[PDB]
């Protein structure tokens, strides 16, 4: 496997898979213009949220960066799934809860189905949404009847 990608991919997997312990999926890069962009897919058990991809951001850029092997520099690019479990019968759409979350409703609010916020609440029948004003929650009820697709999220 001679392709750039496993020494980046091993070498950030490094510093990256070991300290904050998330792993590497693979980082391949990209080139735009002059410079060189390492792009990453990196993973762990259970998802990634934006944070622990901003902590893998910090292992891949900070970690890579503080443990170089690479004489020249290029720009360290990191992505990484948010919470990704559908929203549909309890336990997923429930595990899905904890996080902020889309589902779509088919009646239109308007003209949507598709609303993403912290799950509050969880009804059999209803979804409850928080959006959150500064510090502030609020729960939205979204009936089940009027669902037609429902997930946990990527701000990707």
């Not at 070991?18 to 962009?37: I, S």
């Not at 004489?71 to 990484?80: G, H, I, K, T």
Request: aromatic letters at 6%; hydrophobic letters at 40%.
């Amino acid at each position: 496997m001679a392709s750039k990608i496993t020494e980046q991919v091993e070498v950030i997997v490094k510093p990256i898979m070991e300290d904050l312990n998330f792993e590497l999926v693979d980082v391949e890069y990209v080139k735009e213009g002059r410079d060189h962009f390492l792009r990453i897919s990196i993973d762990k058990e259970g998802g990634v949220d934006l944070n622990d991809c901003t902590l893998a951001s910090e292992k891949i850029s900070e970690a890579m960066d503080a443990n170089d092997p690479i004489p020249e520099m290029y720009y360290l690019d990191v992505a990484s799934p948010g919470a990704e479990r559908p929203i549909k019968k309890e336990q997923d759409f429930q595990n899905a809860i904890t996080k902020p979350v889309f589902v779509s409703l088919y009646v239109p609010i308007e003209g949507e189905k598709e609303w993403l916020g912290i799950l509050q609440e969880v009804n059999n029948e209803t979804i409850v949404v928080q959006v959150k004003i500064k510090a502030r929650t609020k729960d939205i009820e979204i009936p089940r009847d009027k669902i037609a697709k429902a997930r946990h999220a990527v701000m990707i």
